[PDB]
Ligand binder design. Structure first.
Ligand SMILES: Cc1cc2nc3c(=O)[nH]c(=O)nc-3n(C[C@H](O)[C@H](O)[C@H](O)COP(=O)(O)OP(=O)(O)OC[C@H]3O[C@@H](n4cnc5c(N)ncnc54)[C@H](O)[C@@H]3O)c2cc1C
Ligand SMILES: Cc1cc2nc3c(=O)[nH]c(=O)nc-3n(C[C@H](O)[C@H](O)[C@H](O)COP(=O)(O)OP(=O)(O)OC[C@H]3O[C@@H](n4cnc5c(N)ncnc54)[C@H](O)[C@@H]3O)c2cc1C
Ligand SMILES: Cc1cc2nc3c(=O)[nH]c(=O)nc-3n(C[C@H](O)[C@H](O)[C@H](O)COP(=O)(O)OP(=O)(O)OC[C@H]3O[C@@H](n4cnc5c(N)ncnc54)[C@H](O)[C@@H]3O)c2cc1C
Ligand SMILES: O=C(O)CCC(=O)C(=O)O
Ligand SMILES: O=C(O)CCC(=O)C(=O)O
Ligand SMILES: O=C(O)CCC(=O)C(=O)O
Ligand SMILES: [Zn+2]
Ligand SMILES: [Zn+2]
Ligand SMILES: [Zn+2]
Ligand SMILES: [Zn+2]
Ligand SMILES: [Zn+2]
Ligand SMILES: [Zn+2]
Lengths: 594, 594, 594
């Protein structure tokens, strides 16, 4: 009965269908979203969708295009897209950065190539995608002028493959350079230096013995290898292939069983037997610190390739919205939801769903035959739901935590991160004679040139993670850095500062890593995003605690009479867009054939 | 080496001194704070204190009264006391509630009688204390007119006792009635009904088998009994006495060893082998839900007696502040801290400590010989500290989480919670003839009279916990309810609403439990406290995750050259005032005899 | 010595012969019963057979046809066939149901297609067989007009197969619909509804956690899968094939060893670790309740195909009896049995067997050379046996329990179970205008149309199991329902009621499931069978308790000097006819070649 549950969860995880068939639901979603859409088996239905983030838009588009009467209620008054949010200049208000060409991501910023549906959907919309440099690169290497590789998916069904165009064999990502920084414990090296000799940064973390000699990267990878062995095999090639479907699924089932009880921290301590100092170091270097006490699965799931969308992530939501001007109602917030499930405004023969919204944050009533709720559970918590959902669904709405996240963006007049030392001499002397020599004397609070292209630097200071844009905005001399990106307590302290203080601290921190002298190129333009203070999100992502997945995720996905659910949290890919998209499709399929 | 650490932690927990002596540090603190103060072994020193919450005030008072030159830097511009915060009318601004006599607690509200130092300190200041009714009472029982019992502490040193006055044998707390509500899963009973037959509320939680038959109270107690047996023994009397010092300390040491690896949730699931449904129920009814994933110790530690201070909790901080008008600098926020530890503004023979503050949130520099930092670690995180603290102290500042907490207070023109049904007829008909009959017809959204005195009601809805004042404010007809008190995700959603929406939702929720008809007595006055948005707190309390205590708490308490630390987080009584007070004294003792 | 016993028991279970050969005794029985009969190796013998149920008739026919002098003594005065009993109209007495064409089964009603010998024997007698709908079907699907599939058996001997005619490839059973009812805990759904969402009925059973999400069907199947794996393998096809003979037999041997110690209840609780609530639910839904405390094997053994015999089950016994008019003595009950086993009326050179009967329930003496006793052990218990049987045989007669079973049959003037709602309007308005509208208002004791064809409904009320006839009797408008079929305590209470009260309660119960309005079509004709009060049965079946099989079943089958044994109980297929038939043949083979 437990084994039965683990099997069911693994199917959820791996997108596998019921037993007499074992379908590749990745193929079904691709087909439907991309190739064919939906065909209604009978008359169009009235359908209501709450939330005009990516999940609500995707399902809205599919159900509209198949001929259904769709209404999309979005609490936000001026913005669709939810946790897809770009700071961009818009005609009629001042530009978010001094240079009005500049833009930057408030929310989602990178898309994995092991995430097909979202990449397929971007291509289908004829949006242009480029490589997101998660590690800093050599930009006089690779071939990015060649066409973007088509989406290429391989099924477990054997020989079944899905693509959306012809190969691009001459396309090639740039070499990773790893010239960016690790600054922990008042020590500082380049990622490449750490890789060749990790003791430098490890002694600062007070790792001793055989740990000192190992990178945090290798530690985490080795730790996970036995886990991986449950559903796959490292061949003599040194490569990894999934086992046969049965032993591959039972394996993932046995992963659920043996490891959902753990947090990442307890896994590293207890299973991989690492020192508290190693876990400390792993957390800081590998962005795990604040999620160590949360489910191992959250960290476990998520040289791979990442993608950004020319013009910012917003293009994906906004493009979809163009097809749905007629269906999208902005500035309406669901406060009540009533539905009729055989086994006041609803009933037999009357409408089966009734939603009531209020303006912004008047009292409209909306009715229909079926519903999709795509709003985060944080926000669902404060909606009055007339017949309660199932016990475990209600528990899921109560118990699912959302992590705080804040981003802090600083515009620079130049892309100082690229500069060689020589570049710094040129670029400072250009502002005033002697300015190089000045910053050279003055020095720092108790730095060599970064000379990096994309990627980011990692630190223990509150900024934590600093990302450089992967691609320059055509024709501009400057760029926007993600100066601070932090979670949990840090975020909350970032939030409670004044704009000036927050941008001051973010710059002091950037300066601690990069040099005082970066101050000269700051334009005084900064933007902040505080996902906790977002009324319609209250965080970045649904992050589960140990055993939560096991105890109620199968109830998260279930319909509730005529009410269906989609969104990032509905999937087992928490913190990603694919999950919201996979589940939008899934939802859309379901309400179509009801 | 592990056993050695567990022993040391248990001494920290139990306030036991080093081995060749094994002193009762509760006796030392009482003596010093209450009876004698401190005697400096040599010349007075310059001492700087950061934070004018309870810890900074207590140590400020002790060190000033012993003759030292103390300065207290408090970032807040108009308010001392920190997480001790009362909403009270103050001459010159409008009253926080329509009735200007009314007040209510934003922060700390109740003091345990198993917490001597703070109770002793309230008596020593000649502040008046009354019983805090954590469970609702029969108010025609007990004797509270008799003198307040003196603080009476018993040491483990054998026959050593501490009191601050003569006995009060005729003083007697009121009988617990338990007429207040449990409203979970759209079901509702009185605590007393649950106690006699818990199946009603338990089936709503889908507890089955032998759990259905048991109260959550009894489940938690039984669960903890074996743990308790490690350092104590349940005698045939049915009572519990601590074992002999050695087996009592080794026991607490073995508690640290065997259980710090757990969260409360994992303890209940894995150790006490409870169903996920029972843990669900336990969490909701026993206020554990949001802290299930945090350390078992946090929940484990904290028919016992509680105390409130006539005039509000603020009296304790504010009274202390009167003695320290000359030492307290308001509106100054530490941004930098520099110190000289043999083994710029500081050095040998120069001053040993230098702090720099900024106005509110100009750049003053403050120097001295020794320092106490009593600010929460959330706030310490963003202070520049010139020689870094020890590695594990820095890790503690980084890794110690603070929980979000929000309180929502609603003034009522009458104390409807007291009313019998008859009282409701009288009190509504008084507003307009027929008004009783009206609310009787109209009814509810799909309630009997509460008729309770003090205590609170517990629910699954976002309010979660609703507390009724224990004592009426003399001469007033109304009262302030704590309508909503919530943590984690709930708090963050509460926070992001508008005052009107927040007070609207809080009242709808109160009405779901108590009756629609309570609406009539609402005065439209409400106050909110959002401890996450407090720049100087960023939460209620330092709450540790599993193993954190084991890995770095011994480093939390250590001095850092001439820098000492006190405050709620410095102790192993997280979430209480005693801990901040015990550690203020401890700190004060230490800097005195340096 | 234990392993030796388990091996021997598995051979018994699987019909495998001794080691130097390992014959398929299914092939021997088919050959003998069906193709060839028996050839006596020497002169015909005098043979006496007790009991003219299926086992006594089968062996009587074989031994008569091979030329032996057979006498069959049947205690019953007017009826052969034993637990094969049909209520049918017979010229000269009133019809059992108002419509004299109607008939129904008192005893055995369905024959599995995994039971070859009995199906072969029905074909050989040129009796017509049709599908027994154990689950309700879609009757506008399948092909039953095609010839009945021939009996097709596959041996473990490899490539050895047995059939009794040419294939019928166009014959095809109807699709299962599952529109019949589950009514448990005052809740009611269609089997198909339970299958798609089992929580409805499961919450009524107070299953929680991961059980709530699973059907009782899937639970039982999964539970048994590891057991199955002992002697077979689930191939990647998702199908199941027996392992190689040696590992297949050792496997069944290891099944005997590891699981005969269990009851079904203790298996589900202890081995499959199910909640007492799940076992409750499993018992009620899957007809196991009253046999949970009996051997796991009983339940373990017994989408498969079932057969009924046109004209009722009686045809099989009665047809056989026609060939044996000369051998069958009716109305004689064995009271004494005397026999001469070298190592009064019997002795050396005298006759070797002597039986004494009494009329009905005069004192005839019957002699002969060999005997077969086919009477149930309940009845054998009260027979005086001159030289005692072996100790363990005597223990088997004492200790083998027979389960009480009662059937209650109610004739209806129409087959209301078939009806759509529309059909009900038509069929009630036909009795009197408004009658539909009447029952619609009046309603029920605190029901939708069944609209089902064959199968049955399952409930917790005393009826327990209600079966609808699979095929209409040609030319009739009505039908007989098996309204109540119950075991153990229920049966005994059914029994002690008056005909009118029993038929009243059975109808109230039917009405609780199906609708009050079914009352109109009741003809006031009902029949009861109480197998406990049957003097010649005293129950339905020999049902073993845990370990009984292990301790004495090898002694059950052994001859006792010239006395052989056959019948349902002699086999390891307790509760079936095949077992009585397999053992009749086995017996007949043995006495032939003595
Ligand atoms: C800082 C950050 C960075 C991220 N980076 C990445 C990344 O690099 N790669 C990646 O793959 N994913 C990333 N993600 C995750 C990704 O952005 C989300 O998982 C995804 O956008 C989920 O969309 P959704 O439709 O499920 O929900 P949302 O985007 O939350 O949409 C919900 C919508 O509901 C509306 N709404 C809420 N309540 C109501 C109400 N009561 N009535 C009406 N409307 C309401 C909201 O206004 C909103 O538009 C990131 C997320 C964050 C926060
Ligand atoms: C909602 C709530 C309810 C509670 N209820 C209870 C209860 O019922 N019983 C109980 O025993 N305990 C309770 N507590 C806990 C108790 O209130 C605290 O543990 C206690 O007040 C701790 O005081 P402290 O001196 O350690 O810190 P704080 O009270 O946090 O004082 C720190 C001070 O430092 C100042 N400061 C911060 N940063 C700077 C800076 N950079 N420069 C200068 N000054 C700075 C702040 O303004 C503040 O005045 C509760 C707490 C909360 C939040
Ligand atoms: C309610 C019910 C439903 C069943 N349904 C099915 C089914 O669907 N499918 C299936 O395969 N099996 C079914 N069975 C089982 C099947 O009916 C029996 O296992 C089978 O009929 C066994 O026959 P038998 O020859 O072993 O014994 P019996 O049928 O018991 O024959 C024994 C004979 O011995 C006679 N007798 C008894 N004592 C004496 C005496 N002292 N002297 C002389 N004669 C005596 C009796 O009168 C009787 O005729 C069912 C049984 C019952 C009770
Ligand atoms: O961009 C990042 O590094 C984090 C954003 C996120 O939530 C994710 O990548 O899954
Ligand atoms: O008043 C309460 O219930 C909670 C306040 C708190 O933090 C505590 O009691 O320790
Ligand atoms: O018909 C039934 O369901 C029960 C009869 C029986 O004893 C059997 O099927 O083995
Ligand atoms: Zn925009
Ligand atoms: Zn180019
Ligand atoms: Zn004040
Ligand atoms: Zn009085
Ligand atoms: Zn007959
Ligand atoms: Zn036909």
């Amino acid at each position: 009965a437990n084994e039965m549950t683990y099997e069911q969860l693994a199917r959820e995880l791996l997108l596998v269908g019921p037993a007499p068939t074992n379908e590749d639901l990745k193929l079904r979603y691709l087909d439907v979203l991309i190739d064919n859409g939906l065909n209604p088996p009978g008359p169009p239905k009235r359908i209501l969708i709450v939330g005009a983030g990516i999940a609500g838009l995707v399902a809205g588009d599919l159900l509209t295009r198949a001929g259904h009467d769709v209404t999309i209620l979005e609490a936000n008054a001026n913005r669709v897209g939810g946790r897809i949010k770009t700071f961009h200049a818009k005609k009629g208000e001042p530009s978010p950065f001094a240079d009005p060409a500049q833009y930057a991501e408030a929310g989602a910023m990178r898309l994995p190539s092991f995430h097909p549906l979202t990449l397929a959907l971007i291509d289908k919309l004829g949006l242009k995608r480029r490589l997101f440099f998660n590690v800093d690169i050599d930009p006089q290497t690779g071939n990015q002028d060649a066409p973007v590789p088509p989406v290429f998916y391989k099924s477990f069904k054997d020989g079944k493959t899905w693509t959306n165009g012809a190969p691009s064999p001459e396309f090639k990502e740039p070499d990773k350079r790893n010239h960016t920084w690790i600054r922990t414990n008042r020590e500082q090296v380049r990622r490449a230096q750490y890789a060749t000799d990790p003791s430098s940064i490890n002694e600062g973390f007070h790792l001793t013995g055989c740990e000192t000699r190992l990178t945090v990267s290798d530690m985490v990878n080795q730790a996970l290898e036995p886990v991986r062995d449950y559903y796959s095999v490292k061949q003599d090639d040194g490569t990894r292939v999934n086992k046969p479907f049965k032993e591959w699924l039972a394996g993932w089932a046995d992963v659920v069983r043996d490891f959902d009880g753990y947090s990442m921290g307890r896994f590293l301590r207890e299973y991989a037997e690492f020192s508290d100092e190693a876990v400390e170091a792993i957390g800081t270097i590998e962005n795990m610190t604040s999620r160590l006490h949360l489910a191992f699965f959250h960290s476990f799931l998520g040289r791979a390739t990442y993608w950004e969308i020319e013009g910012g992530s917003r293009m994906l939501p906004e493009t979809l919205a163009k097809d749905l001007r007629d269906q999208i109602v902005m500035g309406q917030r669901m406060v009540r939801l009533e539905y009729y499930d055989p086994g006041s405004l609803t009933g037999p023969g009357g409408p089966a769903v009734a939603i009531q919204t209020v303006p912004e944050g008047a009292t409209q009533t909306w009715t229909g035959d079926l519903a999709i709720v795509t709003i985060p559970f944080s926000s669902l918590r404060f909606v009055k739901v007339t017949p309660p959902f199932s016990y475990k669904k209600r528990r899921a709405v109560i118990e699912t935590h959302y992590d705080q996240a804040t981003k802090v963006l600083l515009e620079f007049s130049r892309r100082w991160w690229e500069f060689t030392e020589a570049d710094w001499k040129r670029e400072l002397d250009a502002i005033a004679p002697g300015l190089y020599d000045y910053y050279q004397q003055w020095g720092e609070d108790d730095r060599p040139a970064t000379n990096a292209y994309g990627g980011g630097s990692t630190t223990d200071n509150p900024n934590r993670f600093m990302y450089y844009p992967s691609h320059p905005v055509p024709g501009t001399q400057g760029g926007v850095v993600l100066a601070a990106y932090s979670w949990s307590d840090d975020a909350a302290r970032w939030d409670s500062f004044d704009d000036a203080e927050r941008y001051g601290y973010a710059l002091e921190n950037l300066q601690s890593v990069h040099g005082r002298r970066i101050e000269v190129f700051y334009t005084g333009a900064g933007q902040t995003q505080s996902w906790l203070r977002d009324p319609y999100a209250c965080g970045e992502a649904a992050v589960y605690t140990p055993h939560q997945m096991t105890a109620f995720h199968l109830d998260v996905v279930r319909p509730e009479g005529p009410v269906y659910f989609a969104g990032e949290h509905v999937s087992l890919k928490h913190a990603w867009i694919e999950g919201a998209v996979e589940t939008a499709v899934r939802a859309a399929i379901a309400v179509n054939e009801a």
